[PDB]
Structures are given as C-alpha cells and as structure tokens.
Design a protein around this ligand. Sequence first.
Ligand SMILES: NC1=N[C@@]2(c3ccc(F)cc3F)COCC[C@H]2CS1
Length: 394
Amino acid sequence: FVEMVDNLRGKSGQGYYVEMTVGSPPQTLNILVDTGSSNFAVGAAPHPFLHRYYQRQLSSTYRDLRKGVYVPYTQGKWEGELGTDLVSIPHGPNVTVRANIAAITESDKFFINGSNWEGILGLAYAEIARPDDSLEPFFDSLVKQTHVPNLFSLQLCGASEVLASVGGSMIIGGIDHSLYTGSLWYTPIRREWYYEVIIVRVEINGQDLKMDCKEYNYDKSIVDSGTTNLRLPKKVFEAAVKSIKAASSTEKFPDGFWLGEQLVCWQAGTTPWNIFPVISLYLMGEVTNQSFRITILPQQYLRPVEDVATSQDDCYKFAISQSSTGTVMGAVIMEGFYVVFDRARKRIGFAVSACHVHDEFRTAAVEGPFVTLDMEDCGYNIPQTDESRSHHHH
Ligand SMILES: NC1=N[C@@]2(c3ccc(F)cc3F)COCC[C@H]2CS1
C-alpha cells in the first residue's frame, strides 16, 4: 500500500482528489474522492474552470451508452452523456477496469475555480447513483472485475495568493497500519445508499447536549469526504454554537463568524486554542448498547485561511454549518482520523490518524466502549413519498 500513500492532493476547502486515467490511450484527470455520491463523472466539454477535460473521441475503448444523465443537487447541477471506458488509478491498485463514466457536457456551480480537479469519483452505493441504481458505481465494477477486496480507506490530512495545499491517502482494498495509531473502532453502516451511520450522543467539552438522539440523525447522518464542513441539523447546530460560544465567551466574535461568512484573526502563533472546546460524537458500536466516541479538536473545526491584507495574523473560518438534510461528517471530521469504509462487513472504522493537526495539551481521539442500558433507537425513518414507494426493484 506504500504505492498508495500520499496519492491525494487538493486545496483547503476545495476537496481531495486522486489522479486517474480514462480511455485508450489513457487521458489523465484529477478526480475528487467523494463518499457522498455514487457516479463517476468527468468534465467532457469546455468550461471556464477546467484546464482539461475527457475527450471521448480520442479513446479507442470508449463505448457510448446512448443515454443522458441529469444531476441537480442543493447548491448546483451537472449533466452529461453516459458511456463506458477503461479506467485506472496510477497511484492505486495495478489494475484497469471497464467502468461507467458520465461525460459532463453542461454544469452549474459544480467545478471549483482553482480546485485542480476535473471530475468526481462517487464511492457510495448504487442506490443513490443517477439516473438510477442500475448504473453500477466505479467501486462495484472494480471489485467485480478484479481480485481487489471490497474495502477502501481514507487518511485525509489537513493543512498569501493561493489557498493552502492539502494531502492524504486513499488505500484501495486494504488498511495501511502506518496511517493510524491505537485501536480501530467500527460503527455499522445503517443502510447502503450513502455511508449512513448513527450518532447516539454529542458532547461539547464533556458536556452532553441532552437532546433526543434521533435529532442527531435527523433525517440521516453520513460520512462524506465530498463535504468540507461538519454539517449539523438546525436544532443540533443551534445547541452546538450556543455551547461553543459559552466555552469561548472570553472573546466575542461577530455573528458572521458563527455563520461561517467571516474570519476571526489573532497575532501569528497566538491563537487561544484552549478557549475552544473539543467536540465528541458517540457513534453506535457493533455491539448493541455500546458506542465509541470520536473527539475533534478546534484545530479541525476552525479552518485556517491566509488573509492577503493581514498576513501577520493567523485567520480562521468556523467550519461547522447548518443542514436541512441531516448530519454531514465532512473533511473537518475525517481529518482527525483514518477512516475505513469496510463495505464487505457493512461497517465504518475510525482510528486516530498518524497525520492529524494537534497541540501539546489535547489530541483527536477514538475511545470506547461506552455502554447504555435500554438504549432508544437513534435512527430516523424518512417519510415514504408516493414516488419512492412506486419504484420497482428487480
Ligand atoms: N458529497 C457531495 N457531492 C457532490 C459534490 C461535492 C463536491 C463538489 F465540489 C461538487 C459537488 F457537486 C456531488 O454529488 C452530488 C451532491 C454534491 C454536494 S455534496
């Protein structure tokens, strides 16, 4: 797996990408690693934010599927033509797969200016693939066509004119022991669609938020490398900000900071990290009535941003935000840990990353077990729409 170490790069807040090749001869593209979607989609037409794009015409191995694909999401949209081609990960397993590729022809607020990526690798399940669940995702094709074990793991490492460079590792088909210390704790994958999990308790500086645990998973909780922030449901976000405000009260920040629309600065190397509390998310254990906690530092949820004007100061953005689509454990969360997407055993493993950002006084932690007698079900059951109900699965 040494060949796979440091195979991820990117700019802070703009996503982690892996180099991939598509077609014959191979066209190289930088592809966003996204555990919150299930399509392999690449820029395939000019766009002002793309240096390069996939040219289907240059590939002798390209097969058109003669089917379009339209993908609107909250903040934007992408669309294109479906087809198949030969795909490889140069700094991944020494294999070539025939995979589905959505050739992006038009997009709205999808590509990020300066991100250095031209496509997306959707690593989640067939259930959330577009147009439908018959469009086999890349990982499923990789496992079906090769002898690669059904598991991948992610070590995302966090960091005037440009944004800070980030690095990381995507280990396909295994767990690399030099990327983590201590024990690996597993939480069940609730359902194979997103990488959905269950949060049973939330503590801010060791103080329980005391909400009914279904609120933490309303309407779902997912592990998403494709989202930067820790995103929390409205009521949970409000309680969290109130508690983080209380523990950091000595300093009064503008309302824009808590909304993530304004930076707060301190003289270089003088950031008072100690006034910022740790956040502990307790995840359901493999054993009924057990949980383990993942502990995140302010170094993870206060994202560093270099101000061109005040370069003599350390400036940060609050990287916890409100959600109306449930909890999103984005890169802010993942950056503290080595995360194991054990699809074969339908579970997600967390261990302390060998690369997380920390101080001499506190560390990001993975600790357990924590036991609860007569535990209520913390999972939320999404209201069934007539549309979802009508669907047939053969
Ligand atoms: N995890 C996510 N993945 C998507 C995404 C990530 C990063 C990005 F830069 C653009 C995007 F469109 C791609 O799949 C559809 C939903 C959106 C938003 S959240």
